mmCIF file of C-alpha atoms and ligand atoms in Angstrom:
data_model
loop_
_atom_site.group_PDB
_atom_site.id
_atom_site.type_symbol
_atom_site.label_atom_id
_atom_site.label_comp_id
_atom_site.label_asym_id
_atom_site.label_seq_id
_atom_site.Cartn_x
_atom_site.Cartn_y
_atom_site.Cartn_z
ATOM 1 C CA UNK A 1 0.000 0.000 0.000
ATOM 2 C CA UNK A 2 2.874 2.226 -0.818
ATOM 3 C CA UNK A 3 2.208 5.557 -2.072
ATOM 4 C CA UNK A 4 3.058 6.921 -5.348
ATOM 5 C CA UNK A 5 6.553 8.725 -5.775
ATOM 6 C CA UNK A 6 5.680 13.100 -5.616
ATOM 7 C CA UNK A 7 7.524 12.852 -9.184
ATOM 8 C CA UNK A 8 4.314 10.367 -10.389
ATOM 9 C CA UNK A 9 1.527 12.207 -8.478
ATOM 10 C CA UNK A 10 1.346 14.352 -11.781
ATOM 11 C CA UNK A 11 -0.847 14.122 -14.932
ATOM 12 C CA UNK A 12 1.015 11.298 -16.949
ATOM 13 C CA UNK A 13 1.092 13.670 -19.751
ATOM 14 C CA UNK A 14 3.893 15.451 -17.536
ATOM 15 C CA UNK A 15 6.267 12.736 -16.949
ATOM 16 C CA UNK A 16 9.678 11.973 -17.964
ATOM 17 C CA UNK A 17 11.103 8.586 -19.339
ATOM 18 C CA UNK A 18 12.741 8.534 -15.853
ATOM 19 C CA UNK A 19 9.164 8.720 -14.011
ATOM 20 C CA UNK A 20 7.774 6.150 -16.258
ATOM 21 C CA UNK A 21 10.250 3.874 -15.377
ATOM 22 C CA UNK A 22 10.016 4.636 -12.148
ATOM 23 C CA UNK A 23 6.963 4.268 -12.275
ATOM 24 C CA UNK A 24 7.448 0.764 -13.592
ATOM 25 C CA UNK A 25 8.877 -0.232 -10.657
ATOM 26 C CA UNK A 26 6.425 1.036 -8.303
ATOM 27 C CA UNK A 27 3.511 -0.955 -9.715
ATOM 28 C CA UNK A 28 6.071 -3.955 -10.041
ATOM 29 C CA UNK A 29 6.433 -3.839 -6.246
ATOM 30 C CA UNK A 30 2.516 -2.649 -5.549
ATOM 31 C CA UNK A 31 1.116 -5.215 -7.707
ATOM 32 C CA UNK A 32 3.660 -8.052 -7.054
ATOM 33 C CA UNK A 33 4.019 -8.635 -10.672
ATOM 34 C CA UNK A 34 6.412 -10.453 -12.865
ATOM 35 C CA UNK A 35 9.704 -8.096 -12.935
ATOM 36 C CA UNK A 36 9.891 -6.330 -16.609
ATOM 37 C CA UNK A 37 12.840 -4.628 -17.810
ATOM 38 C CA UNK A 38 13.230 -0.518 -17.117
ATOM 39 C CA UNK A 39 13.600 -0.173 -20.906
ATOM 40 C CA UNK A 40 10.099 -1.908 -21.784
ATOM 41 C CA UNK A 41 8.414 1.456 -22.154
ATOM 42 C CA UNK A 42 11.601 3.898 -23.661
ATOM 43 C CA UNK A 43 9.378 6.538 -23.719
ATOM 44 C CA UNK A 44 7.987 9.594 -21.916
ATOM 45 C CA UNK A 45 4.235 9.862 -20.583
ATOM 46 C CA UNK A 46 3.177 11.721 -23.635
ATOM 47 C CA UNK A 47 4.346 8.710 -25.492
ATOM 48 C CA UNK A 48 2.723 6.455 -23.425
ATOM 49 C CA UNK A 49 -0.610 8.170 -23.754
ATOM 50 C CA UNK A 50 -0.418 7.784 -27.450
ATOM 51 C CA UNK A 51 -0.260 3.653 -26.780
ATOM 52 C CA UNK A 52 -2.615 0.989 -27.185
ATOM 53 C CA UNK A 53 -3.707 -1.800 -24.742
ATOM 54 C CA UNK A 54 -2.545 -4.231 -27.446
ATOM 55 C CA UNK A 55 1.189 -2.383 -27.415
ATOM 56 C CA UNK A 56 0.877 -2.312 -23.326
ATOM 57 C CA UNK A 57 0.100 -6.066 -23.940
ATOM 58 C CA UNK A 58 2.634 -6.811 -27.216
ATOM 59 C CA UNK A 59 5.443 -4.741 -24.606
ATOM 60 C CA UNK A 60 4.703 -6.782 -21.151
ATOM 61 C CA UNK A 61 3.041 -10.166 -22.198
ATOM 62 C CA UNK A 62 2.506 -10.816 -18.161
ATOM 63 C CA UNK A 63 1.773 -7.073 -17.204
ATOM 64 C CA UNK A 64 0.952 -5.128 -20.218
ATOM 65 C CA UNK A 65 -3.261 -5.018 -19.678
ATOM 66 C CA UNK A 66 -2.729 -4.215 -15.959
ATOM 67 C CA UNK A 67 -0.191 -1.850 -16.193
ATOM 68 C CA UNK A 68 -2.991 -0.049 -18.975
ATOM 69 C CA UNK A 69 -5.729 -0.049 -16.836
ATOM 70 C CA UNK A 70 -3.630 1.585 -13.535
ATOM 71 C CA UNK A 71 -2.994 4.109 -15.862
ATOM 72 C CA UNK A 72 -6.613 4.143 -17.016
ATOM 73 C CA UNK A 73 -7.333 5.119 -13.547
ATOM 74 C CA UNK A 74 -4.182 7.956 -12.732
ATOM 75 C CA UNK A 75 -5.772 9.171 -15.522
ATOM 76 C CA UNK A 76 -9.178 9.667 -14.155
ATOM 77 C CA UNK A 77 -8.120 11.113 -11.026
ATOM 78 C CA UNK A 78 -7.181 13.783 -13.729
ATOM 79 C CA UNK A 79 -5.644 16.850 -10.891
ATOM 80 C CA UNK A 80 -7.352 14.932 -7.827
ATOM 81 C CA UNK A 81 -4.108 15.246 -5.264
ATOM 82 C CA UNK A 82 -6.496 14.970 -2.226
ATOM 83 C CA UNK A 83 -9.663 13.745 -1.365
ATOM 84 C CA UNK A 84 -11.462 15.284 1.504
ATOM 85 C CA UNK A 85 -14.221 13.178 3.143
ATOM 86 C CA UNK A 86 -16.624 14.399 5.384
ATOM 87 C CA UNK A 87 -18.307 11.795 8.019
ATOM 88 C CA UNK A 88 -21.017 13.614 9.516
ATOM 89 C CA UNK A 89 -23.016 12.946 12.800
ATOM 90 C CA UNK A 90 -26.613 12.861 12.372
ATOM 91 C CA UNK A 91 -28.282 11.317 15.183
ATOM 92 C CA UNK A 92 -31.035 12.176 17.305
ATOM 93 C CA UNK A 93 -28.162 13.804 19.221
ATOM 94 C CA UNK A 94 -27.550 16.476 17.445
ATOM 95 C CA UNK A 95 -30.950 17.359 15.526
ATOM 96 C CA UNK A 96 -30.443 21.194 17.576
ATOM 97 C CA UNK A 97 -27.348 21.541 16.451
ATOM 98 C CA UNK A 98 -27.147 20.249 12.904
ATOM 99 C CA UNK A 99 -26.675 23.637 10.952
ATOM 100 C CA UNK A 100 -23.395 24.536 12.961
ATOM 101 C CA UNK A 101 -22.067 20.879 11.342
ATOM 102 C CA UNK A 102 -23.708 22.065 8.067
ATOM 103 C CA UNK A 103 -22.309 25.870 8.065
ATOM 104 C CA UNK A 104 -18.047 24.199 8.840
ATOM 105 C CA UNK A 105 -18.555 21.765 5.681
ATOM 106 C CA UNK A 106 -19.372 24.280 4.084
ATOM 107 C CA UNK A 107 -17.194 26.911 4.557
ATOM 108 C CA UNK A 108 -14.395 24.365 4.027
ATOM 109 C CA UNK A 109 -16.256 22.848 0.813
ATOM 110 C CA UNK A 110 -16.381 26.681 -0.613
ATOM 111 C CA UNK A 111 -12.886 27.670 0.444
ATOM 112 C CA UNK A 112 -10.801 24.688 -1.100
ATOM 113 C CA UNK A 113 -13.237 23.738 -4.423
ATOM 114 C CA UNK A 114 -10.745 23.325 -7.064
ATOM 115 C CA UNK A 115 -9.545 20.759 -9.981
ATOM 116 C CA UNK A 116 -6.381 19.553 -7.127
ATOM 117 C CA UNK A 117 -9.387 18.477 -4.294
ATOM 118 C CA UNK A 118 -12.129 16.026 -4.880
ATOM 119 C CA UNK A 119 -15.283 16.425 -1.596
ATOM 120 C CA UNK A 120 -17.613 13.557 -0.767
ATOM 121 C CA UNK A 121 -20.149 14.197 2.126
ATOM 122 C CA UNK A 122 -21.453 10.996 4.240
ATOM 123 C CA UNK A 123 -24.053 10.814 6.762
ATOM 124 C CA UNK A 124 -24.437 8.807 9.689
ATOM 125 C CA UNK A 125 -26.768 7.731 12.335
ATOM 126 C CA UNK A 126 -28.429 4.313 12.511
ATOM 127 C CA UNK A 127 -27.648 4.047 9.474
ATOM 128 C CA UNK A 128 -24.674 5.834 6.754
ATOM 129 C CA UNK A 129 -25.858 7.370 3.522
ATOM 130 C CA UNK A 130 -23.426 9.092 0.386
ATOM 131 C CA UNK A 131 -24.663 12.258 0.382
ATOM 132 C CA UNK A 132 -22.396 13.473 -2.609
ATOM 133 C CA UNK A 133 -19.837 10.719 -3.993
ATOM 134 C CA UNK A 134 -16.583 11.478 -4.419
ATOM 135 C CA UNK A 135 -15.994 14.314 -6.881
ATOM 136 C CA UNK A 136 -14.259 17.530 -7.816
ATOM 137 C CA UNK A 137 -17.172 18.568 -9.817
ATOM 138 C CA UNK A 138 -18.449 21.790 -8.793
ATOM 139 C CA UNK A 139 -22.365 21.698 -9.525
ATOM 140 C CA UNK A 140 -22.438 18.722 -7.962
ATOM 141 C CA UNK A 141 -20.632 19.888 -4.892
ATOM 142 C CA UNK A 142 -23.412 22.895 -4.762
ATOM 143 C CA UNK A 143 -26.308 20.716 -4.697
ATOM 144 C CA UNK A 144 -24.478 18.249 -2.235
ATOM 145 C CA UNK A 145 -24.606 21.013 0.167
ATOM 146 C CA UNK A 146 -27.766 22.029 -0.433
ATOM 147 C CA UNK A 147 -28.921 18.189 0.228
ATOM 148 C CA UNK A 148 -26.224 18.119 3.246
ATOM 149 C CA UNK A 149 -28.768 21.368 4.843
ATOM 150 C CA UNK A 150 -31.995 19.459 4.271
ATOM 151 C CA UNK A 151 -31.068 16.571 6.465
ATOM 152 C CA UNK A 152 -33.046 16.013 9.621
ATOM 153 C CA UNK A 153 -30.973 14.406 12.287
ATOM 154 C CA UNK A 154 -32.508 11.080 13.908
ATOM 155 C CA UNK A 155 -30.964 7.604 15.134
ATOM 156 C CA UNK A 156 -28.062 6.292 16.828
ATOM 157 C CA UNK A 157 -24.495 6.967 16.637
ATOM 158 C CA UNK A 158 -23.230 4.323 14.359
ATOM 159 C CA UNK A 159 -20.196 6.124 13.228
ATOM 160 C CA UNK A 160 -18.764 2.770 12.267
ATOM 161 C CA UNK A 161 -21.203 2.779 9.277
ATOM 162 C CA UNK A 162 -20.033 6.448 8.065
ATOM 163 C CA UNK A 163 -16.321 5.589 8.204
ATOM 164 C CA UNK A 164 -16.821 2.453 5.905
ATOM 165 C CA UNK A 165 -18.715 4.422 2.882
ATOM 166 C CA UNK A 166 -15.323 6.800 2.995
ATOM 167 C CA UNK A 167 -13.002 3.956 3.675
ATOM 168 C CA UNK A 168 -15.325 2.255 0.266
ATOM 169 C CA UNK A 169 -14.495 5.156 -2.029
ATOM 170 C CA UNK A 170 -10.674 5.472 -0.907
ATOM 171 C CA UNK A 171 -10.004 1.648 -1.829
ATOM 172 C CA UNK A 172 -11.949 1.971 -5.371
ATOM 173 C CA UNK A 173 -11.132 5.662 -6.138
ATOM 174 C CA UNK A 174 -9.032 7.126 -3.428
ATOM 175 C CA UNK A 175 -5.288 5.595 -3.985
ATOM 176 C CA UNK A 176 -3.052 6.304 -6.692
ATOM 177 C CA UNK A 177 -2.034 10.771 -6.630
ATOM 178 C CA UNK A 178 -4.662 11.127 -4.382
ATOM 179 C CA UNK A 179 -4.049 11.909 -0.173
ATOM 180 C CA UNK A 180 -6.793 11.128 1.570
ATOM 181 C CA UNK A 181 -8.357 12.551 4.812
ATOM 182 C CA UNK A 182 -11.031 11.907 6.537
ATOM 183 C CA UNK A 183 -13.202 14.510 8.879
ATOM 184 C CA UNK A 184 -15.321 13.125 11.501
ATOM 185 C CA UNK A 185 -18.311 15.395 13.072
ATOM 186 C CA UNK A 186 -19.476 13.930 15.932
ATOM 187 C CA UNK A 187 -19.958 14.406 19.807
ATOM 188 C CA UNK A 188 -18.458 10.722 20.525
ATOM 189 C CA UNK A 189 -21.214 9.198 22.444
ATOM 190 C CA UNK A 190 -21.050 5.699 21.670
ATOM 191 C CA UNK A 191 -22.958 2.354 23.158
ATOM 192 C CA UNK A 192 -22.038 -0.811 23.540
ATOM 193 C CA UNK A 193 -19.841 -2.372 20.957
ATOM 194 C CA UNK A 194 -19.911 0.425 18.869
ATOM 195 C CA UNK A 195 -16.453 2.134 20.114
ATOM 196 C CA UNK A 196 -14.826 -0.926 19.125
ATOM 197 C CA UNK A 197 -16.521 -0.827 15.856
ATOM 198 C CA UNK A 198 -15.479 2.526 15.307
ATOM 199 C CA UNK A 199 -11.573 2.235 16.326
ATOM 200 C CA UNK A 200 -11.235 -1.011 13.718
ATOM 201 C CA UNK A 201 -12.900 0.318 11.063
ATOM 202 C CA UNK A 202 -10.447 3.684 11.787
ATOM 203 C CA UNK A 203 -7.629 1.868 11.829
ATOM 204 C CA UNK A 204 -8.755 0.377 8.349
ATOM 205 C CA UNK A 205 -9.081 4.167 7.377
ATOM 206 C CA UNK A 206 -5.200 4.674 8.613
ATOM 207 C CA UNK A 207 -4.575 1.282 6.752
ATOM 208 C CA UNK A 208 -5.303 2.905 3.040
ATOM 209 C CA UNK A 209 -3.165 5.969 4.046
ATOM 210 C CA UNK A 210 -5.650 7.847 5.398
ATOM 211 C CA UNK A 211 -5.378 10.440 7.815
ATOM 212 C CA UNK A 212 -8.571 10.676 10.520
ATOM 213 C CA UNK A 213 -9.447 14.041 11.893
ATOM 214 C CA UNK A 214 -11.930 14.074 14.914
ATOM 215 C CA UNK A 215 -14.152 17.754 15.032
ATOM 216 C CA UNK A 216 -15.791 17.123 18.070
ATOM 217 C CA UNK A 217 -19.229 19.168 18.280
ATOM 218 C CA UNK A 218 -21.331 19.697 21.658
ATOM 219 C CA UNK A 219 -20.061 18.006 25.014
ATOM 220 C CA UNK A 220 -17.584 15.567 22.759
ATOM 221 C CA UNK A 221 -16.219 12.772 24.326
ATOM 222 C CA UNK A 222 -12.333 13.797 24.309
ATOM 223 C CA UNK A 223 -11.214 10.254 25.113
ATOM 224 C CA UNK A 224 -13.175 8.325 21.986
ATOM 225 C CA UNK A 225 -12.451 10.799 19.358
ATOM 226 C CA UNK A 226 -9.085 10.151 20.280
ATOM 227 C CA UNK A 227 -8.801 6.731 19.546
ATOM 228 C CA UNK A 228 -10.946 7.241 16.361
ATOM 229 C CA UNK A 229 -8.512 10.017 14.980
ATOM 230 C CA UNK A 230 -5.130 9.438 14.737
ATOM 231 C CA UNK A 231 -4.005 11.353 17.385
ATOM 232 C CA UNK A 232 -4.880 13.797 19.974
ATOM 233 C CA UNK A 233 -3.749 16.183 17.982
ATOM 234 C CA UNK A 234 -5.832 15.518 14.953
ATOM 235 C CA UNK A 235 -8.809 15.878 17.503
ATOM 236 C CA UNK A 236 -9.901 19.654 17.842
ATOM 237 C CA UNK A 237 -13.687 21.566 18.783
ATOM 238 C CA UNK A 238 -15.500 22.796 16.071
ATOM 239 C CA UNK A 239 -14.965 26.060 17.122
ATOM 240 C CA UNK A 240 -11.471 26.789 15.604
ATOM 241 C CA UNK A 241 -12.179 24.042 13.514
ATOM 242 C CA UNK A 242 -12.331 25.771 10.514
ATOM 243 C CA UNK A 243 -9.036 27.410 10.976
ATOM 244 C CA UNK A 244 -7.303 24.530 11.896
ATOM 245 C CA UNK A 245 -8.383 22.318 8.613
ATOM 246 C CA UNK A 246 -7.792 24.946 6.135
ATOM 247 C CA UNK A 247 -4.184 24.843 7.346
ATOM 248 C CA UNK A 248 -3.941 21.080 7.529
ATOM 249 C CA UNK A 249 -5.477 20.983 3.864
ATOM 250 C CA UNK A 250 -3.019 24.296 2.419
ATOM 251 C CA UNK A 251 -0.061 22.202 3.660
ATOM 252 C CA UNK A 252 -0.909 19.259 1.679
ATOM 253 C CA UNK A 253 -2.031 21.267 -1.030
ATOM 254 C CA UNK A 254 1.496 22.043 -1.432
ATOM 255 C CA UNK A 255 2.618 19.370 -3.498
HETATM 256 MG MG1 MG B 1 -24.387 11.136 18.405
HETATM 257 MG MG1 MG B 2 -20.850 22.014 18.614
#
């Protein structure tokens, strides 16, 4: 589950005959596939663009259609470099307090909408819901919003639920150039089995290279979004929340 090299987190169409070499190696290693020579593809990305499957094929016999369709999907991350995921409480809990959770997504969705960040929004109570999949798409991020301010809050805190749809999306569509993070709104109030729900399926978040951010809203339970996030220092209040992400976000912008 290596990531990609910084040099190969670009479009293809930028790379060098060194980066597609290295990145040769990379998927060699990633995809534990038979070892090819570094001179199979004595080209630059450009060059590679302008291949077939049946040359990726005709050039790697054992890797040629695989190595095709990874690049079929660098390619559709198009300038994705980080995918922002927002896990949002909506239980009974917090039915009083839902536009405050409404009003931070989307000051962050409005401040960072751009062709380098792809936004999908995720609901959760007793049950988890995709309010807006994955996408950079602009329209589409509008009218997530505006569906993200109709919601009604009602249930139980099954956070486990919301962290899986992200967790979903980051193993289909969420690898490759693409840093992932994921920001949980909730207060923390868990029962039963649920914290240990929650902790496994965040450590399967932290598992894909994803980095789990706690925004704890109302009287938050310090100690669980703790072990949810990564660490105590990825778990802030809402208030100042806003100012804290859009740093957090800027410095991996910066790529
Ligand atoms: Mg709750
Ligand atoms: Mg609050």
């Amino acid at each position: 589950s290596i990531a990609l090299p910084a040099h190969l987190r670009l479009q293809p169409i930028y790379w060098s005959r060194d980066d597609v070499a290295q990145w040769l190696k990379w998927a060699e290693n990633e995809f534990s596939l038979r070892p090819i020579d570094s001179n199979t593809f004595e080209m630059n990305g450009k060059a590679l663009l302008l291949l077939t499957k049946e040359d990726f094929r005709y050039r790697s016999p054992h890797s040629g259609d695989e190595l095709y369709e990874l690049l079929q999907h660098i390619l559709a991350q198009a300038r994705a470099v980080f995918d922002l995921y927002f896990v949002l409480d909506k239980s009974g809990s917090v039915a009083n307090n839902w536009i405050e959770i409404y009003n931070f997504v989307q000051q962050l969705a409005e401040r960072f909408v751009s062709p380098e960040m792809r936004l999908s929004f995720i609901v959760f109570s007793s049950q988890a819901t995709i309010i807006l999949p994955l996408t950079g798409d602009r329209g589409k991020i509008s009218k997530g919003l505006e569906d993200l301010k109709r919601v009604s809050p009602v249930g139980e805190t099954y956070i486990h639920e919301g962290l899986k749809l992200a967790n979903e999306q980051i193993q289909k569509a969420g690898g490759l150039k693409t840093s992932s993070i994921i920001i949980a709104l909730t207060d923390g109030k868990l029962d039963g089995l649920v914290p240990s729900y929650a902790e496994k399926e965040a450590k399967i978040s932290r598992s894909l290279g994803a980095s789990v951010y706690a925004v704890g809203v109302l009287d938050f339970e310090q100690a669980q979004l703790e072990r949810i996030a990564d660490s105590k220092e990825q778990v802030f209040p809402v208030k100042g929340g806003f100012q804290a992400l859009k740093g957090i976000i800027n410095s991996i912008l910066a790529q």
